[PDB]
Amino acid sequence: MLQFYRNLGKSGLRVSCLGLGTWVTFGGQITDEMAEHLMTLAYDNGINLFDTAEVYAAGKAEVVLGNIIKKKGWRRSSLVITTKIFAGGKAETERGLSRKHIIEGLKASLERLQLEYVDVVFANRPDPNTPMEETVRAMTHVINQGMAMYWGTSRWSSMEIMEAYSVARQFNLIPPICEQAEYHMFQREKVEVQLPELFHKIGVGAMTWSPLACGIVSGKYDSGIPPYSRASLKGYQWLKDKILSEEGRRQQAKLKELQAIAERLGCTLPQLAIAWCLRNEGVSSVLLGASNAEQLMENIGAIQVLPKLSSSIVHEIDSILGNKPY
Amino acid sequence: MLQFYRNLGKSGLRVSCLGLGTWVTFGGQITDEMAEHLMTLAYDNGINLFDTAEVYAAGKAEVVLGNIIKKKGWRRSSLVITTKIFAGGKAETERGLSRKHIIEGLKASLERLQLEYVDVVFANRPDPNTPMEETVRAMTHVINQGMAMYWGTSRWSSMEIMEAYSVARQFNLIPPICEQAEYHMFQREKVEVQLPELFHKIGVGAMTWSPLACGIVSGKYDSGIPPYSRASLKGYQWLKDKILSEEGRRQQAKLKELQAIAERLGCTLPQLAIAWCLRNEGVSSVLLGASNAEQLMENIGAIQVLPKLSSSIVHEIDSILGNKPY
Amino acid sequence: MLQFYRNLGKSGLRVSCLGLGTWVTFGGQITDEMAEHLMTLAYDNGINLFDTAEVYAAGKAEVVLGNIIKKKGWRRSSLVITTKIFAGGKAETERGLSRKHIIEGLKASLERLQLEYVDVVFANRPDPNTPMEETVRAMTHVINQGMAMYWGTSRWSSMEIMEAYSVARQFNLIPPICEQAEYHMFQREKVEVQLPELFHKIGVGAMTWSPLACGIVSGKYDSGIPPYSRASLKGYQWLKDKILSEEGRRQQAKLKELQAIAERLGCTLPQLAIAWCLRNEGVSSVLLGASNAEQLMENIGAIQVLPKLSSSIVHEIDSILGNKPY
Amino acid sequence: MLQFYRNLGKSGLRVSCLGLGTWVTFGGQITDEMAEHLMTLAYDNGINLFDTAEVYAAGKAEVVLGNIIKKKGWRRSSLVITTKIFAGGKAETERGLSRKHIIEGLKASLERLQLEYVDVVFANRPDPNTPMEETVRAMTHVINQGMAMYWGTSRWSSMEIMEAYSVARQFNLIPPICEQAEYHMFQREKVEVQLPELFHKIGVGAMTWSPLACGIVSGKYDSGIPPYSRASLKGYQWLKDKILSEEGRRQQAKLKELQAIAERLGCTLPQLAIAWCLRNEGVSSVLLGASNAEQLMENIGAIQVLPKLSSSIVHEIDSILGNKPY
Ligand SMILES: NC(=O)C1=CN([C@@H]2O[C@H](COP(=O)(O)OP(=O)(O)OC[C@H]3O[C@@H](n4cnc5c(N)ncnc54)[C@H](OP(=O)(O)O)[C@@H]3O)[C@@H](O)[C@H]2O)C=CC1
Ligand SMILES: NC(=O)C1=CN([C@@H]2O[C@H](COP(=O)(O)OP(=O)(O)OC[C@H]3O[C@@H](n4cnc5c(N)ncnc54)[C@H](OP(=O)(O)O)[C@@H]3O)[C@@H](O)[C@H]2O)C=CC1
Ligand SMILES: NC(=O)C1=CN([C@@H]2O[C@H](COP(=O)(O)OP(=O)(O)OC[C@H]3O[C@@H](n4cnc5c(N)ncnc54)[C@H](OP(=O)(O)O)[C@@H]3O)[C@@H](O)[C@H]2O)C=CC1
Ligand SMILES: NC(=O)C1=CN([C@@H]2O[C@H](COP(=O)(O)OP(=O)(O)OC[C@H]3O[C@@H](n4cnc5c(N)ncnc54)[C@H](OP(=O)(O)O)[C@@H]3O)[C@@H](O)[C@H]2O)C=CC1
Ligand SMILES: C[C@]12C=CC(=O)C=C1CC[C@@H]1[C@@H]2C(=O)C[C@@]2(C)[C@H]1CC[C@]2(O)/C(O)=C/O
Ligand SMILES: C[C@]12C=CC(=O)C=C1CC[C@@H]1[C@@H]2C(=O)C[C@@]2(C)[C@H]1CC[C@]2(O)/C(O)=C/O
Ligand SMILES: C[C@]12C=CC(=O)C=C1CC[C@@H]1[C@@H]2C(=O)C[C@@]2(C)[C@H]1CC[C@]2(O)/C(O)=C/O
Ligand SMILES: C[C@]12C=CC(=O)C=C1CC[C@@H]1[C@@H]2C(=O)C[C@@]2(C)[C@H]1CC[C@]2(O)/C(O)=C/O
């Protein structure tokens, strides 16, 4: 009963239940050649959603993404391209959600992307130094300028998202259509409890990220930090610490148990985790990440796992994780 | 007492009581040469309204229409060009009334038409997957961008049209000026009963289509499906089935009777049917269709029939049709 | 105590108490060479206001005006250029105050004028076929598009002007700043009684036209229709009839009497009439007309007459005219 | 506890506590070479705020400023460029806060600056001939046109600033973010008493100017008008009169006393005065002025003085000045 394509929240924007992101990989960990192959595989498999950000690889991720789109020549109208704005430089005025950086940042992202507009522009995170009204007016402005079709939030609290809606309705501006939130077996609270309320109240959709907790859910770290793994990359010592932390090892213990259900269902752990992220209608789309073609094809195969996630299967997983939100 | 030119609803847009459409014919059933001749004949006879759609002939109808306008060099200010948006591609995001497709779709139609803007952009049909607010904001945006002068609805229910007005007045956006509805002797309810209410309440005008029920009213199918007829064209098996259906034959029976009044008045059946469509002020303009010059000139001659449609004549027709709405 | 420059109504637009119009003369009755000289004389004498219209000489007036501006190279910021829109073609959709013609009409005027925008765009007259809301939205749109700085009305009733303000305040649009009304010794009611109310209520300014009643006030028709006079021009038989009419001769009788006061003051009749038009603060600016340099220099000399228009002088004129409004 | 960078009022625009202005110097008193050096020194020292005006050196200040920015090639996103509009020509319509001059004036400033937009456009002073609504709509328009990111006021009373906010909230326009006010030891009332109220009430920020009272606070006029001093420049006889005035000499007397505290703290008088201007959070940024590199480097050194401005030090200064506002 799964519908591969669904509306992003209550907006009219239709997206595939699975998207492909560019964090770490594009313009960084992987070659442009591998990136091209990954996007082609995604696109050919129905995926129309591709996420990026001005900060990814200091802007190179957007460059690679734009190059592929141009080289492949896919119709712009058949793609949903999203980017996020917060950190776009070292200068004081090159970061934040001020009108100045919103406009300068998106303009610079579009130039790198070789695109006239993105379908959704996201505030990559909350800005405690900029009043909501200024931010909402700036997002509304770029949409009115044809630089984006819609806008959204990322890593914002339920209250801050409602605040953006409040400002939009008071000054007759455009409200946000989606919140890009982290969601995986070890981070469920926000997406399972809070976001559903925002959907029914103000139509906000949930586009989730890091469905494998940066690859931790794959269980490839059951025995240390494998070579070439994200956790072994430069600038990702923070990930390695989380993996080697006390809590990071307790997660591995639970994973081994989840692995049992995986093989018992005839799928891999990553496929179980990803399918798990889509088990509820509440999630509009799960943004995937992959360093090679084997991972992506495996991940996409998660769709076939959905039908096997019965009530019993879900309860067993909850008993194992032991973190089912109230 | 007929006024050849009238306002489209309560808007200031003045249109001829007869327009020329491009469905099936332009870029499809007829040659560009024949299309040029038909439009010239229309224009030279006072017709200033020409309708098309992104979906007609996969966009070719708009191409032919734009070519003629350019080749003939008529002043853009002397023309009322309308197009409709819903289905503009095979991709998921290439259909619907989302802001994304509204903007991408109209932009693509304008490029094909070689025009900077259309006078009216229509939503070709209702979109159950896009909230009215998003659609109304998108229509308002393209009007503000100078891509269209006004917007309208097509195949929308009275309630959905009122809903668009509601959103427009609540968020101070631009309301629709017209609804493009089917109207002929075998489809009267909506146009005769509901649309008049929308005109007096929210100024919505009625621009009607298929005045001959795709040619069925001409009675050329009194004996099967004549060669080259629309019903015998590829992709129009649906029309042939309606003609050969039980109800389709009962219509022919009534037509034969209507034919009596036609010849009794000194006009053809198509002229009687078309003049009938304009008998009431409620209809701002009737969109004509034609595959050759004989049909168009005949159709235009319907204007001369109007004066003969007395109360008695109208009552006789009602008795024959037996479908006068309450 | 006269201030040569004053605000046009309550707006911030500052105009000279005297402007130079282009009706009949520019691109028509006079040569481009004479037009250039007249504008230069005006500009050099402090006049910054120049009025035209899409209908004047079928658009040639705007062409000549734009040529002079370009040839002389005066700073655009030192000029106040106004044009009026209603009749811009023979086609049905080429006339009126519909959004379509407002945009097409002004765009075409600007191209002829070789200007990016006019300071004020006027609706040349009321349009009974277009709802006020559509007209006000269209004027607001062109101002927002940078095609005009402000907009105004011409030949509108006090109630229709208040209606435009009503729509502007209800839908948060831009209200009109001025009404271009006829004003001379034989047409005082509207300007003296009604316009002052609009100024204090909604800040509307009064820019008056035909201060010499098309030249009739000069008294050059005291003995028929002199050669080369406007009344003897082709297409102005209507003016000749008004002059030769019973009322037209009764005006001449009164003029002869006014002539007495003129010579008694040391000025010409035209100078007395023009100075009379500016005697009250209510009039922001009087638009002058002239076929040669002698008339213009004479007319401009009306400024020196103002100081002599005492209460007694004004009362004597009222006794003669006998048309002082209540 | 000083934060070099702070928000300009409640807006999201982040500026350095010290800015560099161009009045008198750029394109005038100093060479383009010296101007380039001064800006480079400022920029390299963290200063991101540079102020100018259409009136400075008849537009040359903006030309020099734009040349430096272009020659140095600093990222536009790392700069906060502000300009002020009021007097942009000799013609009547070339001055004021009318929509006409706002648009023409800023457009001309941007061309001279070789920039697409300024971060903040200021009304250089109040305009008693233009209604607030017109001015606020014009500022909102240029911001919506991408010609400026924000707008502000300069030399406006607290009530006039609140009036601009009132109009903005009534017609849903954009309110001002900052007021550029004079602030130095001999002008404290407005900035110390009134502006703080506007900050808490409507978020208006305080960007101050002439922190050395045009150089008077430096005490270089303790013995007349030194050569090359601003007071000895052409067109600045007004400054010399203020210095040589009775009150101007009484200020010198107080300065000599302040000098005691300066040397007693280990800093110069200008450093004490400038640091004094930043002692309170109320001031977002102090705009500096300098004719040579020695002055600028000295002035910037005022930051190190801030830590020494204890309560006692501030009280001693108040006792000396004897002008502490109520
Ligand atoms: N809004 C925001 O702030 C954020 C948004 N995002 C978005 O979400 C997207 C996805 O996030 P991401 O963290 O990459 O997602 P995941 O948590 O799914 O991690 C994907 C990474 O895990 C590894 N992996 C993937 N599949 C497999 C597999 N089958 N077997 C083994 N290892 C596998 C790969 O890394 P390796 O091979 O190197 O181990 C890959 O790069 C991003 O690209 C971005 O677009 C992400 C973070 C934040
Ligand atoms: N908003 C919407 O969804 C829709 C809008 N429209 C608009 O309305 C327009 C008119 O619709 P359309 O269905 O073409 O109109 P009609 O119902 O009037 O049918 C016209 C067709 O009937 C035949 N015909 C026309 N005149 C004669 C005649 N005198 N004698 C015999 N046959 C005749 C021709 O087909 P043939 O010779 O092949 O038999 C011609 O193509 C369209 O072109 C389009 O612009 C149409 C449908 C939907
Ligand atoms: N909003 C609207 O609908 C209208 C606006 N206007 C505006 O107002 C302007 C002025 O109107 P207009 O009717 O021309 O003004 P006047 O009533 O002042 O008439 C001017 C004409 O009278 C004659 N004249 C002028 N000065 C003298 C003189 N000193 N001695 C003798 N004859 C003289 C000239 O015509 P001749 O030498 O041929 O006798 C000249 O063309 C127009 O150009 C236009 O811009 C005008 C009409 C309508
Ligand atoms: N909004 C508005 O209406 C106004 C805004 N402003 C803005 O504020 C900025 C600063 O104003 P400004 O009056 O120049 O500032 P100051 O009051 O600080 O005076 C600076 C001037 O004083 C002298 N000076 C500076 N430092 C020293 C020093 N250490 N020792 C001795 N003399 C020194 C220099 O002049 P010299 O060497 O010639 O003596 C220099 O040009 C302007 O450039 C402008 O951007 C200014 C006025 C009005
Ligand atoms: C998609 C939309 C309009 C286009 C856009 O850029 C952002 C949004 C977000 C909020 C949506 C809004 C609508 O279109 C109407 C909605 C969906 C509203 C939330 C409640 C709402 O007002 C409602 O429930 C319809 O009545
Ligand atoms: C034409 C118009 C404005 C231009 C446009 O793009 C769309 C519309 C549709 C609705 C119209 C509106 C008007 O202009 C004023 C009308 C005609 C309104 C319906 C009721 C109305 O408000 C009225 O009755 C006047 O008072
Ligand atoms: C000039 C202006 C704004 C710019 C414009 O394009 C048209 C107008 C016309 C109406 C003016 C308006 C104002 O600026 C404020 C005014 C002048 C208003 C009439 C009453 C008003 O609201 C008032 O009295 C101030 O309080
Ligand atoms: C920065 C801002 C919006 C961007 C802009 O161009 C100008 C302003 C000035 C007024 C600010 C406004 C806000 O962003 C919200 C503020 C800061 C408001 C003053 C009160 C306010 O409404 C408030 O207190 C938040 O609730």
Side-chain angles (χ1 to χ4, degrees), chain C residues 75-312:
Chain C
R75 307 191 296 287
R76 179 71 184 81
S77 56
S78 73
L79 292 162
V80 181
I81 306 305
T82 64
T83 197
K84 305 185 286 299
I85 300 295
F86 193 100
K90 286 189 175 182
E92 184 70 12
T93 48
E94 289 172 343
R95 68 174 302 174
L97 300 182
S98 65
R99 180 190 178 84
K100 177 179 175 68
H101 182 52
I102 290 302
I103 296 176
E104 303 183 325
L106 182 53
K107 183 172 191 296
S109 289
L110 293 174
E111 293 176 299
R112 287 191 292 273
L113 284 164
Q114 290 186 272
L115 297 174
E116 180 185 58
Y117 57 81
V118 290
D119 292 277
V120 192
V121 56
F122 286 88
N124 216 329
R125 53 155 293 184
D127 184 355
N129 288 161
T130 301
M132 188 63 72
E133 175 177 352
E134 181 178 322
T135 297
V136 178
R137 285 178 176 285
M139 294 293 193
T140 298
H141 170 74
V142 296
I143 289 177
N144 281 315
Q145 283 303 88
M147 292 165 72
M149 293 295 171
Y150 315 88
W151 76 278
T153 64
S154 177
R155 305 181 208 167
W156 282 35
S157 69
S158 290
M159 179 270 283
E160 295 176 308
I161 295 169
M162 184 56 75
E163 192 193 354
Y165 184 83
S166 180
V167 171
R169 290 321 192 194
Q170 173 171 22
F171 302 102
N172 198 185
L173 307 171
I174 298 174
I177 68 168
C178 166
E179 152 67 16
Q180 233 188 70
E182 168 177 26
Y183 190 51
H184 50 76
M185 308 190 130
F186 299 117
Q187 191 62 281
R188 319 165 50 168
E189 210 295 310
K190 184 173 173 181
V191 172
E192 278 174 37
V193 183
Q194 305 185 64
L195 299 188
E197 294 293 305
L198 292 175
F199 170 73
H200 296 301
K201 288 173 181 296
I202 52 174
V204 174
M207 180 183 298
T208 67
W209 46 264
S210 292
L212 299 178
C214 298
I216 293 176
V217 181
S218 80
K220 80 170 69 190
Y221 300 112
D222 71 302
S223 195
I225 310 302
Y228 288 60
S229 68
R230 177 180 293 180
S232 68
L233 289 172
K234 181 196 298 182
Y236 292 76
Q237 173 66 63
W238 61 271
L239 174 53
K240 184 179 183 182
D241 301 321
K242 293 183 176 180
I243 298 175
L244 295 175
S245 68
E246 195 185 315
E247 182 185 61
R249 306 315 300 172
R250 180 168 50 264
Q251 292 179 171
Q252 294 287 173
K254 295 173 184 175
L255 289 176
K256 210 290 183 294
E257 304 181 63
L258 296 168
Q259 173 67 58
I261 298 175
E263 57 185 300
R264 200 180 72 202
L265 286 175
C267 67
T268 61
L269 188 48
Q271 296 181 315
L272 176 63
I274 293 174
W276 179 84
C277 283
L278 286 168
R279 72 181 188 296
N280 294 304
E281 296 66 61
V283 173
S284 290
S285 183
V286 171
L287 294 175
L288 300 173
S291 53
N292 61 248
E294 180 179 350
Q295 309 185 329
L296 181 62
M297 291 313 284
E298 188 192 318
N299 293 172
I300 296 176
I303 307 302
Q304 280 64 231
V305 183
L306 274 168
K308 276 77 79 64
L309 290 179
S310 62
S311 303
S312 176

Side-chain angles (χ1 to χ4, degrees), chain A residues 92-94 100 104 134, chain D residues 12 14 75 77 117 119 150:
Chain A
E92 184 70 12
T93 48
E94 289 172 343
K100 177 179 175 68
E104 303 183 325
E134 181 178 322
Chain D
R14 300 275 292 180
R75 307 191 296 287
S77 56
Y117 57 81
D119 292 277
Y150 315 88

Side-chain angles (χ1 to χ4, degrees), chain B residues 5 7 10-14 48 75-80 117 119 143-144 149-150 169 172-173, chain C residues 89-94 98-100 103-104 107 129-131 133-134 137 141 145 170-173:
Chain B
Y5 291 105
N7 288 80
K10 288 194 178 180
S11 77
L13 185 58
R14 300 275 292 180
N48 70 352
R75 307 191 296 287
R76 179 71 184 81
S77 56
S78 73
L79 292 162
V80 181
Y117 57 81
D119 292 277
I143 289 177
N144 281 315
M149 293 295 171
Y150 315 88
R169 290 321 192 194
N172 198 185
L173 307 171
Chain C
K90 286 189 175 182
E92 184 70 12
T93 48
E94 289 172 343
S98 65
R99 180 190 178 84
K100 177 179 175 68
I103 296 176
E104 303 183 325
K107 183 172 191 296
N129 288 161
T130 301
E133 175 177 352
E134 181 178 322
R137 285 178 176 285
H141 170 74
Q145 283 303 88
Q170 173 171 22
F171 302 102
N172 198 185
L173 307 171

Side-chain angles (χ1 to χ4, degrees), chain D residues 16-27:
Chain D
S16 44
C17 61
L18 291 177
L20 174 62
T22 62
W23 179 45
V24 180
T25 58
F26 282 53

Side-chain angles (χ1 to χ4, degrees), chain A residues 88-95 98-101 103-104 107 127 129-131 133-134 137 141 145 170-173, chain D residues 5 7 10-14 48 75-80 116-117 119 143-144 146 148-150 169 172-175:
Chain A
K90 286 189 175 182
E92 184 70 12
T93 48
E94 289 172 343
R95 68 174 302 174
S98 65
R99 180 190 178 84
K100 177 179 175 68
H101 182 52
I103 296 176
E104 303 183 325
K107 183 172 191 296
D127 184 355
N129 288 161
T130 301
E133 175 177 352
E134 181 178 322
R137 285 178 176 285
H141 170 74
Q145 283 303 88
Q170 173 171 22
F171 302 102
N172 198 185
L173 307 171
Chain D
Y5 291 105
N7 288 80
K10 288 194 178 180
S11 77
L13 185 58
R14 300 275 292 180
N48 70 352
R75 307 191 296 287
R76 179 71 184 81
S77 56
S78 73
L79 292 162
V80 181
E116 180 185 58
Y117 57 81
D119 292 277
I143 289 177
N144 281 315
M149 293 295 171
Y150 315 88
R169 290 321 192 194
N172 198 185
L173 307 171
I174 298 174

Side-chain angles (χ1 to χ4, degrees), chain B:
Chain B
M1 63 172 263
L2 177 80
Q3 307 296 156
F4 193 79
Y5 291 105
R6 57 276 292 285
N7 288 80
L8 180 53
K10 288 194 178 180
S11 77
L13 185 58
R14 300 275 292 180
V15 300
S16 44
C17 61
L18 291 177
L20 174 62
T22 62
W23 179 45
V24 180
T25 58
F26 282 53
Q29 172 185 28
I30 69 175
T31 68
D32 298 359
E33 293 69 41
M34 174 67 96
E36 191 187 304
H37 181 57
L38 296 180
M39 179 156 203
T40 300
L41 289 170
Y43 189 84
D44 295 338
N45 277 279
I47 295 173
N48 70 352
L49 178 65
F50 302 85
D51 183 62
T52 195
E54 73 180 324
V55 69
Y56 296 167
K60 294 185 284 287
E62 293 173 324
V63 174
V64 174
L65 180 56
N67 288 336
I68 299 169
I69 296 173
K70 182 175 177 174
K71 180 176 180 302
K72 299 301 299 178
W74 298 307
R75 307 191 296 287
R76 179 71 184 81
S77 56
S78 73
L79 292 162
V80 181
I81 306 305
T82 64
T83 197
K84 305 185 286 299
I85 300 295
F86 193 100
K90 286 189 175 182
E92 184 70 12
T93 48
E94 289 172 343
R95 68 174 302 174
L97 300 182
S98 65
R99 180 190 178 84
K100 177 179 175 68
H101 182 52
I102 290 302
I103 296 176
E104 303 183 325
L106 182 53
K107 183 172 191 296
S109 289
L110 293 174
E111 293 176 299
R112 287 191 292 273
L113 284 164
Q114 290 186 272
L115 297 174
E116 180 185 58
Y117 57 81
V118 290
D119 292 277
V120 192
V121 56
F122 286 88
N124 216 329
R125 53 155 293 184
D127 184 355
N129 288 161
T130 301
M132 188 63 72
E133 175 177 352
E134 181 178 322
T135 297
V136 178
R137 285 178 176 285
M139 294 293 193
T140 298
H141 170 74
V142 296
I143 289 177
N144 281 315
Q145 283 303 88
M147 292 165 72
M149 293 295 171
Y150 315 88
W151 76 278
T153 64
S154 177
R155 305 181 208 167
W156 282 35
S157 69
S158 290
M159 179 270 283
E160 295 176 308
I161 295 169
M162 184 56 75
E163 192 193 354
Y165 184 83
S166 180
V167 171
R169 290 321 192 194
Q170 173 171 22
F171 302 102
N172 198 185
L173 307 171
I174 298 174
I177 68 168
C178 166
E179 152 67 16
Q180 233 188 70
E182 168 177 26
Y183 190 51
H184 50 76
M185 308 190 130
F186 299 117
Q187 191 62 281
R188 319 165 50 168
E189 210 295 310
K190 184 173 173 181
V191 172
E192 278 174 37
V193 183
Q194 305 185 64
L195 299 188
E197 294 293 305
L198 292 175
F199 170 73
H200 296 301
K201 288 173 181 296
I202 52 174
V204 174
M207 180 183 298
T208 67
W209 46 264
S210 292
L212 299 178
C214 298
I216 293 176
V217 181
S218 80
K220 80 170 69 190
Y221 300 112
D222 71 302
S223 195
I225 310 302
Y228 288 60
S229 68
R230 177 180 293 180
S232 68
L233 289 172
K234 181 196 298 182
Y236 292 76
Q237 173 66 63
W238 61 271
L239 174 53
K240 184 179 183 182
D241 301 321
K242 293 183 176 180
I243 298 175
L244 295 175
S245 68
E246 195 185 315
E247 182 185 61
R249 306 315 300 172
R250 180 168 50 264
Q251 292 179 171
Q252 294 287 173
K254 295 173 184 175
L255 289 176
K256 210 290 183 294
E257 304 181 63
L258 296 168
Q259 173 67 58
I261 298 175
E263 57 185 300
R264 200 180 72 202
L265 286 175
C267 67
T268 61
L269 188 48
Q271 296 181 315
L272 176 63
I274 293 174
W276 179 84
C277 283
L278 286 168
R279 72 181 188 296
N280 294 304
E281 296 66 61
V283 173
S284 290
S285 183
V286 171
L287 294 175
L288 300 173
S291 53
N292 61 248
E294 180 179 350
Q295 309 185 329
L296 181 62
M297 291 313 284
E298 188 192 318
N299 293 172
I300 296 176
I303 307 302
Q304 280 64 231
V305 183
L306 274 168
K308 276 77 79 64
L309 290 179
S310 62
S311 303
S312 176
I313 299 302
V314 184
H315 186 296
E316 293 180 50
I317 299 177
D318 279 320
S319 302
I320 296 170
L321 296 176
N323 62 350
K324 180 188 181 61
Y326 290 70

